[model samples]
Target chain A: LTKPCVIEYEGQIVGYGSKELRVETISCWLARTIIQTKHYSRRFVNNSYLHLGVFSGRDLVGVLQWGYALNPNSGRRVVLETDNRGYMELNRMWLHDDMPRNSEARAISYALKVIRLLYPSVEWVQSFADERCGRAGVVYQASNFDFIGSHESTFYELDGEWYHEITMNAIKRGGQRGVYLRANKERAVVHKFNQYRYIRFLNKRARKRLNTKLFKVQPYPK
Target chain B: LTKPCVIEYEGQIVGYGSKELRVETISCWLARTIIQTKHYSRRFVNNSYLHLGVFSGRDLVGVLQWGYALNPNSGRRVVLETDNRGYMELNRMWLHDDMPRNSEARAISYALKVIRLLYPSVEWVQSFADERCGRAGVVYQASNFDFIGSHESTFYELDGEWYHEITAVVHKFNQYRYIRFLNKRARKRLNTKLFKVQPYPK
Candidate 1:
């Protein structure tokens, strides 16, 4: 029931004068600014299908950018939904530091509810907790998303800094010819990290439509 | 002289009618949280010379970590005084999104003033503007830093992202160099570095 929620600390204002907190669709530019400036990943996906901006009083606090999964087959593997509009991915979530604790989880839960109404055909949402950011999917778990799986990610520890395999490829293929940039050097210092995957069905029907029983609700990874 | 500055929009308080804005030394842990969480690098330097935290009312608005330059001889190259304490580098800066416009430049100015008083030996400061972040050095440009030089910093393009070369190399980004003399003594003592000051890339 999208009830009006007041911020815990609304300046020194008294009752009814509290901060107005709401979430709604916002411009791609607004979400891009917040994500590139505040989020760990400075890049915002250009193909985002939906951009949700959450506000507290007069300040724009956080943004959740949704799009299709990077892995094109991810949607079909998770659900029997044939229509592209039936599935989505939570690509990016960036929040202001001043936000209250659990606000990310709270914002996420709100987004799921709103997504159901705005895009009725959307059946499920899949998101990933980058291992580099922190522990596995704590925010997703808090938002009641199912912990589906975890996969190993590779990196090359060149010198002392760790570079993700994807990051290295972008550099190499971008026209790099340094001697040390050879494939052998990259392979010589391989490192692995695991990122946890999560999914949430919009409703009972969506969950029932899932294609795989292989994901038996795996335990949350620390 | 060091004076108190208040944030323009400090809730609705009256008396002083402002939110306290101050910058002081902080802990690595505090700075790490802000930088790793918000900064693009997500990596924290360990051998910091000093960690400064700027506050807006009760919130930590930003952080400035000053340390020895990645190049061990950067200090000596900048100033003939050659003492380790004579020069320092701004290793990292992470500010909150809500900070007012130009707050970064303002914070840098304030920190420079404070560093002069606290670390009297610190004659100058060196900082870099990674092109990956945005412009060449808009913040440094606004803070009155002299544009020393610009160089290509290679990044290894892996799976999809670009990572700076650690000894190994890859793609490239224009790295902007900036420096500022803190006092008359340092300004006079400065040497002819390999490169000369040029217009800011910004």
Candidate 2:
């Protein structure tokens, strides 16, 4: 929330509240390309349907992807006892550094608005705030997402980059770990941390149905 | 804008500011179902990509559909100088009668916000206000749409509703054009002579 973005794309200012900043629906491969090329997290989601591109004018600067929850039962078992069909997850999102303060939250707001209009069945969206990226769900809080719960998670830092255990496993014997392990096995840092959980219901029905029965919306974690 | 409408869906109140009134991305078939059944205009556009459903709780009450411009050269010839990919029309939209006053405008607002996010290529949105509905672009005016121009439109009122030229019926009226620019750059880049932003009509 400190710096004012003045990045340029095709001779125009691109930033939060700038006229050049816009959102557009994009293809999965397009979103994937940007995520893989620019994303902090090297791992792009495997299951994503609603792919979004954030543009600074005509230049694509960010990508937000959505899909079924990582835990298939996250919605049915934990949040809603009745319907799991309406649940979705903001699985992967990556924005360029030049995007102005709170642009991520604003992007989420816009994304959720679009989600409400486009995906009627997507009643609620859940996402996790990784400890490596944030101390809390500050961005989600700014976007008015509900604090659901925090759970223990582990990540391995290899070559100054953090990767989920699943991501670590996915890296082939020759791709990531193979190269890192042969040279510096002791350099790998494993951290056990709390992954903050946040949820935003797309509509009132989901909020009412979920909150009343199972998932109690807690105060925004500090 | 005056009275808060407190209508219901099952057991809940579906009002202007109620949480029950939510937008959702929907399939063209689902949107067409509502538009064809509930809309005054029975004709749905041939080309459409973005289809939105306005839900009152779990029940669908309205639909908004976007598509390519009616004219082949409507985009590059009028709105933008270099790109035709960014221009789109709010070709068709319909809301149930029970929806609160100004809900149409609110729906457009919500739709545009989504379009801004989902369709990054969309720079401006244009729609026509049929005289059959009102005398002016009242809904668009409420949504801060710039009045463009008015053109004569012909239709036939068959079976208490309007019909197009493909069918043989009798009526002549005006359809007002209203456009909303998503970005300041787009507005400035547009050729004002052909795509002028005229004053809103009463």
Candidate 3:
């Protein structure tokens, strides 16, 4: 749905659009073992990935395969819903496994630069652990990611064989867990009755009061 | 590709295709208790199925859905190859779970009929697990699926999540473990080295 990204090196912010820098960094990971050919072989074809890359001073340092919505029933179309408004289910994340450990500094720098780019294009990114990818997610968290929800799966059979499927909900703002996506669109709103609990409410109040002191609360109409 | 089928009508192989009947079934075991919304919220659309169900000629009886290829990488096509020229992988075999227990007589009749239908499609159909349909290939021996190859899957990840994706081969051949599909294509030649080691060999 969005265009592939590039970067501007000479101006504005921390050399954030350097496409070349990002590509070089990611290639290093591929040269190493962070991502393998066998692993890539199976997942590269999955329907989730959008496009992922890093940018710094017109250089691209790393690459990631972002996830998108799924239509399990290939023959049918259905509406997709999630609790988080700005979120993408991250499927695979890697720079290049071949990169030397000495390049760690460059890797971190690239990560910071990409997050900055995400601020405009991304509300949030979500991921989970299977057996192998769980370890991969840990790597992302080490880089810094927010935790959301976890679930197990079940299945059913037809024509003598079985099928596996699951229903998932998005993470909400109040940390309140409930049905976020429904066949009914109106139920998604988190009203006052469903607001944060006493402790969470207190925490929000404290932060809001702190913000009020430093900035003006621009107001117009209700 | 080959199909091994079985069929029955009025207690006879009246209008059928295959000689033997073998059905492969699979199911998935959830590590944790499943969490589902009860009050009728169409929240997240889950493709995961509940469980396996076996049926009789009329009423619904047994349930099952455990194992492997369920909710498979539905789009990607698999290329089947066999080491032995005379043998082939039976891609799919269908059967009713309750048919076996309800009345082995009538069930066997229906099983034969189903096999008859499948025999014309592929060389043979093996029982492998599928998590999507909740089909765990536990009914292999019961449905007369013969063991062929054994494999172990340590761990594999898909779409950032980790899971065990395993593969095993089965056939409708009772002792020989071979069920060739009648109308299937010529199977790709297989190298004998690929066959698993067994105490006895022909």
Question: Model 1, range A86-114, lDDT digits (tens) per residue?
Answer: 78888888776767766777678767766
Native interface contact recovery, all models: 0.00, 0.00, 0.00
lDDT of 3 by residue, B135-157 (tens): 22334344444334434334443
In order, the B-chain TM-scores come to 0.79, 0.80, 0.33
Off by over 4 Å in 3: A1-6, A9-41, A45-50, A53-62, A71-85, A101-121, A153-222, B1-202
| Model 3 TM-score relative to the real fold | 0.26
Docking class of 1: incorrect
B108 in model 2: Cα distance from truth in Å?
A: 41
TM-score for each candidate, following the candidate numbering: 0.44, 0.42, 0.26
Per-residue lDDT tens digits for candidate 1, residues B39-148, read 66666666466777766653456778887876656577766756777788888888777777777887788788667666777778888887776543788888899888
Instruction: List candidate 1 segments past 4 Å from native.
Output: A1-222, B1-20, B132-136, B156-169
All candidates' lDDT scores?
A: 0.67, 0.67, 0.31
TM-score of the A chain in candidate 2? 0.73
